Amino acid sequence: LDSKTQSLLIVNNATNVVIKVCEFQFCNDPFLGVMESEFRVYSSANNCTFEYVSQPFLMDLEGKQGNFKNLREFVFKNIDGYFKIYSKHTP
Amino acid sequence: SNLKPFERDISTEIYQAGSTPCNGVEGFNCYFPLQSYGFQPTNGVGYQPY
Ligand SMILES: *[C@@H]1O[C@H](CO)[C@@H](O)[C@H](O)[C@H]1NC(C)=O
Ligand SMILES: *[C@@H]1O[C@H](CO)[C@@H](O)[C@H](O)[C@H]1NC(C)=O
């Protein structure tokens, strides 16, 4: 994860799911700001081999406390070069 | 090590064949993994590009 090999990056930032496969330079403390005012998940793009962006949607974006309403489960596995993502959303 | 099916792996790390941690200079038991052969119209059947 230091630009010497290829690294898959998946971000779901409440609107459009974006998937990229780049030789990314990651920060010492990766983050996206929360109205959002930062984007520091990576610091460079170089010799990138794949990018995909989905359609928009709407999700939570603000700081709001309470009790949890949505359980969102995922499985991530890599078999013979195929990166398989499974998921289930439930109230 | 060898490759798993359909895996790609781009890397310019110079390959220490032995225990000499060269870490930036090619040498004995320290080579680059990427090699290139050339293609010429005068080459043989088995050495022409496909
Ligand atoms: C999430 O990332 C995508 C990547 O292109 C960007 O277009 C989108 O505006 C981002 N969402 C924000 C900043 O809320
Ligand atoms: C990868 O990035 C390097 C950066 O120095 C560049 O020279 C090279 O042409 C790029 N492509 C490949 C296939 O290595």
Task: State how far the Cα of B16 lies from the Cα of B31, in Å rounded to an integer.
Answer: 7
Residue A69: closest CA among A59, A78, A79? A59
Residue A76: closest CA among A91, A65, A63, A87? A87
What single-letter DSSP state applies at residue A80? T
Q: Which residues contact ligand 1 via a Cβ below 6 A?
A: A 13, 15-16, 18, 36, 53
The verdict on a CB contact (< 8 Å) between A6 and B4 is no
Q: Is B13 on the interface with A (CB under 8 A)?
A: yes
Contacts of A82 in chain B (CB under 8 A): 6
Q: Sign of the C-alpha dihedral, residues A44, A40, A19, A8?
A: positive
**Which ligand 1 atom minimizes the distance to the CA of A32?**
13
Quoted resolution (Å): 3.0
Task: State how far the Cα of B42 lies from the Cα of B47, in Å rounded to an integer.
Answer: 10
The tokens for A36 are 């959002």
Say how many CA atoms lie within 13 Å of B9 toward its Cβ. Answer: 12
